[PDB]
Design a protein around this ligand. Sequence first.
Ligand SMILES: CC(=O)N[C@H](CCCCNC(=O)CSCCNC(=O)CCNC(=O)[C@H](O)C(C)(C)COP(=O)(O)OP(=O)(O)OC[C@H]1O[C@@H](n2cnc3c(N)ncnc32)[C@H](O)[C@@H]1OP(=O)(O)O)C(N)=O
Ligand SMILES: CC(=O)N[C@H](CCCCNC(=O)CSCCNC(=O)CCNC(=O)[C@H](O)C(C)(C)COP(=O)(O)OP(=O)(O)OC[C@H]1O[C@@H](n2cnc3c(N)ncnc32)[C@H](O)[C@@H]1OP(=O)(O)O)C(N)=O
Ligand SMILES: [Zn+2]
Ligand SMILES: [Zn+2]
Ligand SMILES: [Zn+2]
Ligand SMILES: [Zn+2]
Length: 575
Amino acid sequence: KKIFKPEELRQALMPTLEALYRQDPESLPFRQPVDPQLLGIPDYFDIVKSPMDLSTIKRKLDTGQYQEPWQYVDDIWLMFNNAWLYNRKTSRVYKYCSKLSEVFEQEIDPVMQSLGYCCGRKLEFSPQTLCCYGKQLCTIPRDATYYSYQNRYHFCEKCFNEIQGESVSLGDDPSQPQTTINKEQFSKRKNDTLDPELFVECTECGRKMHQICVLHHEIIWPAGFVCDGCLKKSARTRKENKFSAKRLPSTRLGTFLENRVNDFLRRQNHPESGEVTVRVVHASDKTVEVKPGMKARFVDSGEMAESFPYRTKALFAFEEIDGVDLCFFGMHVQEYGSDCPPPNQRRVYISYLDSVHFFRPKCLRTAVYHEILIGYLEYVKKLGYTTGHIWACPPSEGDDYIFHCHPPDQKIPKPKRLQEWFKKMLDKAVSERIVHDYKDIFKQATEDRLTSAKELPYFEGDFWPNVLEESIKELEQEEEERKREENTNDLSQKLYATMEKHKEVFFVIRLIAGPAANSLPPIVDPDPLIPCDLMDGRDAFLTLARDKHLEFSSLRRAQWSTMCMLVELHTQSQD
Ligand SMILES: CC(=O)N[C@H](CCCCNC(=O)CSCCNC(=O)CCNC(=O)[C@H](O)C(C)(C)COP(=O)(O)OP(=O)(O)OC[C@H]1O[C@@H](n2cnc3c(N)ncnc32)[C@H](O)[C@@H]1OP(=O)(O)O)C(N)=O
Ligand SMILES: CC(=O)N[C@H](CCCCNC(=O)CSCCNC(=O)CCNC(=O)[C@H](O)C(C)(C)COP(=O)(O)OP(=O)(O)OC[C@H]1O[C@@H](n2cnc3c(N)ncnc32)[C@H](O)[C@@H]1OP(=O)(O)O)C(N)=O
Ligand SMILES: [Zn+2]
Ligand SMILES: [Zn+2]
Ligand SMILES: [Zn+2]
Ligand SMILES: [Zn+2]
C-alpha cells in the first residue's frame, strides 16, 4: 500500500499549477477568491454553493490538505466548471477559462502517469437520454421538458396529458403490485444532467483509477483489479482473457472474410497493420409480413406471397490494437434463400453497416472496409445468391446506426460521397469478376420491364415496403377528392416516379447473370444458426450501449465498450 505525503505530492503537482498561474492574463481573474460586491456582479456566490480559485488550491497544496491527487484535480476542474457556468461564452473570462484547462490536460496526464495513476482527467459520459414507459414505443428527449418519477420511471411532454386521466392511476408491472398517484406529484426538469465515469480500486494501491483507462472487467478477472505497476514489480501478468473476439465461435462466413482481409494486409506489408478478426455473432431465420396496403391489393387477391422468409446475420470486425481487442466495423444482412417466393428469391440485402474509425493504419482503413463488403458478396455468390441490394443512405444528424456515440471527428459522409464510396468497391469487385455489373434501382426496373409493384423485391425495413403502403393511400384519398368535385399502372406509375427521384441512393448488384443463373442447385448455408438476442437487429445493442454507457466516441472508451460487448456475447452463449 502507498500513501501520499503532502510535500512529496506538492513536488509532483506544483509544476502543473505554477504553470497555470503563468498564463498572462488568462489566469489573472482566477488568481484570488472572487468576491461579488467588489467585482460588482451580485449573484456569483448565490448561484455556486462552493467557491474556488488558484490561490485556494495553491494553499491547499502547501498546508497539506491533499491526501490523494484527484482532490487536487477535481478542485481545479471545479474552478473552470463553476466559472464557465457563470459567465457568457462571448466574455473574456470564458475564453481564458478554456486556455488554462488546455494547458492543464497537456501537463497533468504525464504527471499522473509518473505517480502511477494511469491518466489524469476528470471525465464524464454523454447526456444519457432516457425513454418512455407509457407509450412503450416512444422515448424521452434530451434538453427538453421532461416528466419523471421514482428515478425509475420517465415520461414525455405529450405522454401523461392523454393517458389514464389527470391523475396517475396507471402503475403496471409484471408483478401484481399497482399504483395510483396524483397529477401534481411529478418532478419537472430539463435533461442536462451528465453522468460521471466510474473508477476501480487496486489491491495494493487503493488508487481510484478509471475503469476505461486501466480496462478492468469484473467478469474477466474476478480475482481483483491489480494495476500494471503492482503487476510489474511482482513480475506478474494478468491471467489471459478468454472473452476475446478471436475466441468467439468461428464460422465459414467469418473465416472467409477474416482471411480475405488478413491476406490483403499481408500483401500490403504496412508497418502499422495488425491482424483482423471477423465474426458472425447472430444467425436466425425470420419473416417479413407484407404490408396491409399491398396485402389486399395483392396477397389476398392471389398475385404475391403473404410473407417472405430470410436469414438475418450480424458480423463484426475486430482488430488487435496495443494488445487489446477493438471493434471497428459491424454489419446486418438479409439472406433470402432459394426456398423463398419470388421476386425476393436468391437475394442479399444490407440492412445496416457502420464503423468507428480507429483502424490502424488509417491509410488502409477504407480498403479494409471494401474487402469485407466484397468478401461478403463473393461468399454469398459462391453459395449461389444472384442479386445483392444496397440502400446507400447515411444516417441523419446525431443518429447512430450500430455503434453508440461515435467520435466527434468522424465525418458522416454526404450522400454523394457515400454513393461514390460504394461505386469504388463495386468497381473493384467488377474487376475481380466477383461482381458482373450493377445498376441503380430505377434503371434495373427499366431493364427488367417491370409492370406491377409485386415484381419489386420486398425487404425488411427497406424504403419501398414503407413507401408502397403510403403510395397506395395517396391514391385512396385521390378518389375521395375526385368524388367530391363531381357533383357540381395505377400504382406502377407512382413507384416509377419515386424511383426516378431517388435512383442513385439505391444499388442493385448483379452477382450472377445469364447461363448460370438458371441451372442452380439450392442454397445451403454451411453455418448453423447462432441465436443471440443482443445482436438480433441494431436496436437491442444500442439500448445496452445507451444504458451501460458503452460509447465509441474515444479510442479509450471503444476499447472498453468492445471488451464489455465481447463478454456479453460469451455469456449470452450460456443458458
Ligand atoms: C429509414 C431511413 O430513411 N434511413 C435509415 C436506414 C437507412 C439505410 C441503411 N443503409 C445502410 O446501412 C447501407 S449504407 C450505410 C452507410 N453507413 C454509414 O453512414 C455509417 C457511418 N459511416 C461510416 O462509418 C463511414 O463513412 C463508412 C461508410 C464506413 C465509410 O468510411 P470510410 O472511412 O471508408 O470513408 P468516409 O467516411 O467516406 O471518409 C473518408 C475520408 O472521408 C472524409 N470525409 C468523410 N465525410 C466527410 C464529409 N462529410 N465532408 C468532408 N470530408 C469527409 C473522412 O473524414 C476522411 O478523411 P481521411 O480518411 O482522409 O481522414 C434509418 N434507419 O432511419
Ligand atoms: C520573428 C518571430 O517572432 N517569428 C518568426 C520566425 C521564427 C523562426 C523560424 N523558425 C522556423 O522556421 C523553425 S519552426 C517552423 C515552423 N513552421 C511551420 O509550422 C510552418 C507550418 N507548418 C508546417 O509546415 C508543418 O506543420 C511542419 C511543421 C513542417 C510539419 O508538419 P507535419 O504535417 O509533419 O506535422 P503537423 O503539421 O505538426 O501535424 C500533422 C498531424 O497533426 C495535425 N494537427 C496539426 N496541427 C494541429 C493542431 N494545431 N491542433 C490539432 N491537430 C493538429 C495535422 O493536421 C496532422 O494530422 P494528420 O495526422 O491527419 O496528418 C518570423 N520571422 O516571423
Ligand atoms: Zn486513469
Ligand atoms: Zn412520451
Ligand atoms: Zn496498484
Ligand atoms: Zn500507409
